[PDB]
């Protein structure tokens, strides 16, 4: 979530990030329940107040909401104890933020995002952009290893593929910001733009990437003015599931068919429908690539045709149960690297070593009855050093 992103920031960047136009406002909406109220109260005060008052301003019931709110904002450093007055810059900026101082676009966003996913999968026809490809490759969801050959899709790529568009997009932008620092792009400048949306060289390049993801569209040959799409600020289902592992999806976009084929065998493709079967071969194939049963059930659930919405649960139990079982069988044999011990002359030394391993966390499994245990190779040096030291 966005809260996780802002939480992991230094005080120095935070106040700089608290730009006048929006950041003081965008971070405000994040404040879940109570911090909003407390923020306004101490918005016209130039005198810090004792910490006891804040604690006793929430009734005994629901007192937990108070602690979480105060802890959440302390990390955001909106105020300082000064002994709880707010940051003068934020106070000033916020006061300036408080009385002081389309149909085609979504289709473009829908279309532009769809083609990106087409390129993400092994689609022979897709939009070509060297900057986009390398960005995804360094995004952690793709690896090429050979510039001449088109890059393949890593295990993380499939999991990302089956995610819903909001979570899919939001995570995608999350990696962009982390990679923005690595490439040298200032994080604060680019970040502030996203907040301003919901109301320089880097900016033009950053906007160009945003325009590439389909969030924005200049529409005037790359003019200064931009009209953000719906996805910039931040649908009925179609798949019908039977009880015999048969899927009838009313899909015309090749993306949906490609996604379904990832974990099912396609049988027929009608102009407004397609028939697929969820057989062991397909599901384990998807599980082998890296997917887990949760995404498929969620993916099938989210794209659920209205016909099956009446029945509760929406997905028939057998289909859900069978999918979960198929993944479980794959990981019946759980492999864990380790080093075994043998020939313990005395159990006291074995017990002492066990306590040492437990303290360091090196131990992975122990057997008191057989007087043996297993240690990962990383801890093998530590225990080996301990054995040498005697």
């Amino acid at each position: 979530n966005l809260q996780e992103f802002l939480g992991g920031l230094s005080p120095g960047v935070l106040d700089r990030l608290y730009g006048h136009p929006a950041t003081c406002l965008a971070v405000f909406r994040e404040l879940p329940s109570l911090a909003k109220n407390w923020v306004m109260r101490m918005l016209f005060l130039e005198q810090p107040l004792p910490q006891a008052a804040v604690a006793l301003w929430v009734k005994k019931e629901f007192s937990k909401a108070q602690e979480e709110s105060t802890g959440l904002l302390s990390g955001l450093r909106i105020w300082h104890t000064q002994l709880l007055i707010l940051n003068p810059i934020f106070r000033q900026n916020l006061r300036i933020a408080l009385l002081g101082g389309v149909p085609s676009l979504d289709k473009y966003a829908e279309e532009r995002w769809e083609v990106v996913l087409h390129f993400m999968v092994g689609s022979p026809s897709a939009a070509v952009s060297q900057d986009l490809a390398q960005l995804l490759s360094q995004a952690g969801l793709m690896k090429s290893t050979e510039p001449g050959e088109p890059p393949c899709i890593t295990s993380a790529g499939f999991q990302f593929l089956l995610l819903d568009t909001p979570a899919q997009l939001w995570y995608f932008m999350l990696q962009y910001l982390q990679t923005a620092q690595s490439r040298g792009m200032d994080l604060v400048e680019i970040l502030s733009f996203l907040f301003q949306l919901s109301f320089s060289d880097s900016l033009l390049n950053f906007l160009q990437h945003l325009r590439e993801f389909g969030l924005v569209f200049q529409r005037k040959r790359k003019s200064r003015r931009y009209y953000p799409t719906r996805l910039a600020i931040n649908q009925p289902g179609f798949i019908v599931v039977e009880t015999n592992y048969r899927l009838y999806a009313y899909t015309e976009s090749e993306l949906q068919i490609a996604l379904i084929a990832l974990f099912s065998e396609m049988l027929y493709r009608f102009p407004n429908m397609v028939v697929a079967q969820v057989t062991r071969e397909s599901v384990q194939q998807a599980i082998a690539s890296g997917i887990t049963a949760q995404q498929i059930i969620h993916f099938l659930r989210t794209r659920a045709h209205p016909v099956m919405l009446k029945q509760t649960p929406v997905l028939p139990p057998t289909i859900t149960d069978q999918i979960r079982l198929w993944e479980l069988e794959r990981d019946r044999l759980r492999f864990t690297e380790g080093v075994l011990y043998n020939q313990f002359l005395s159990q006291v030394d074995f017990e002492l070593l066990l306590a040492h391993a437990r303290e360091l966390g090196v131990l992975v499994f122990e057997n008191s009855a057989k007087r043996l245990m297993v240690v990962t190779p990383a801890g093998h040096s530590d225990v080996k050093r301990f054995w040498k030291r005697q």
Partner: peptide, 15 residues
Amino acid sequence: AKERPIWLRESTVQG
């Protein structure tokens, strides 16, 4: 009365 068994009412799979 005459209610269905637990192992049939809900999935017994560890998921």
